[PDB]
Homo-oligomer: A and B are copies of this chain.
Amino acid sequence: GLPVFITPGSGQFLTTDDFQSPCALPWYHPTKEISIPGEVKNLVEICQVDSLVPINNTDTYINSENMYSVVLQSSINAPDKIFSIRTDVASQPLATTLIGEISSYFTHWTGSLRFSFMFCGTANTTVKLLLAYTPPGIAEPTTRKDAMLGTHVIWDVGLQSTISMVVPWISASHYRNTSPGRSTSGYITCWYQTRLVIPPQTPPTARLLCFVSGCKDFCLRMARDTNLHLQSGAIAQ
């Protein structure tokens, strides 16, 4: 009939192939589709959702909602530096957040992240927090001064319980490896510009929340298996 020449690779089963295959139920007409709200089409949709960062991941608060908040003091003797976290999507604490989890399912990432903060204090409690970003390459600041000498924000809580700041994408290559780096990672440091000021008969302390999501330019490439979930159990039915 028609002269054909078989090519190297024929008959092989490549788990990542893409060919047609006979339908086992050719006559069956599948149930119609209906309108279910919330269709997701791209994982980026999930990455742009702010999720709480377990900022206070110490042994004391490890398995409680307290691992998601930091306690701000009003006493004059609390250390200037409040908390610090690396900016690599896959590094702790970010790792276990929404964007962190989806990122752990890929090998290359790129883009900017958006950190948002919420002051869980009283309506009369005011304070000035210094939120500073440190580019990759240099070790995180050690004093309020050094911190404000770099890029930062003097956030005045009274009158605005929320604020966001965008960490830019600074890298040699277009996309960077999904695995956490220390010398190749940035830092987010929070400092007391002033302590908590409050009127009489008011809680001397207040909590602080931290959120994170990717921006429009956030993107992932080359899927791998997440390492945030290790299954070593029965899974008995």
Interface residues of A (CB under 8 A from B): 1-14, 16-29, 31-32, 173-175, 221-223
- Interchain CB contact (< 8 A) of A16 among B2, B4, B26: B26
Q: CB-nearest residue of chain B relative to A3?
A: B1
Main secondary structure of the interface of A (DSSP, over half): loop
Q: Are B9 and A222 in contact (CB under 8 A)?
A: no
A19, B7: Cβ atoms under 8 Å? yes
Q: Are B13 and A22 interface neighbours, CB within 8 A?
A: no
B174 and A31 within 8 A (CB) = yes
Q: Which of B18, B20, B28, B223 has a CB less than 8 Å from the CB of A222?
A: B28
- Other A-B pairs, 19, CB within 8 Å; known A4-B4, A6-B6, A25-B222: A1-B4, A1-B5, A2-B3, A2-B5, A3-B5, A3-B7, A5-B7, A7-B19, A7-B21, A8-B11, A8-B21, A9-B19, A9-B21, A14-B24, A16-B22, A16-B26, A18-B26, A28-B222, A32-B174
Partner of A13 from the list B5, B8, B24, B174 (CB cut-off 8 Å) is B8
The 8 Å CB contact of A25, one of B16, B26, B173, is: B16
Q: Is the CB of B23 within 8 A of A16?
A: yes
Q: What B residues does A8 contact at CB under 8 A?
A: 11-13, 17, 19, 21
Q: Could you say which of B6, B16, B221 contacts A29, with CB atoms under 8 Å apart?
A: B221
Q: Which of A12, A13, A18 has the most CB of B within 10 A?
A: A12
Can you name the residue of chain B whose Cβ is closest to the Cβ of A28? Answer: B222
A34 to chain B, nearest CB (A): 9
The 9 closest A-B pairs by CB, nearest first: A1-B3, A6-B10, A7-B19, A4-B4, A6-B11, A8-B13, A14-B22, A2-B4, A5-B7
In the bound complex, residues from chain B placing their C-beta under 8 Å from that of A20 are 7
Chain B residues within 8 Å of A11, by CB: 6, 8, 10
A11 nearest CB neighbor, chain B only: B6
Are A16 and B24 within 8 A (Cβ)? yes
| Chain B hits for A22, CB < 8 A | 9, 14, 16-18
Known: A4-B2, A4-B10, A7-B5. A28 touches B174 (CB 8 A): no
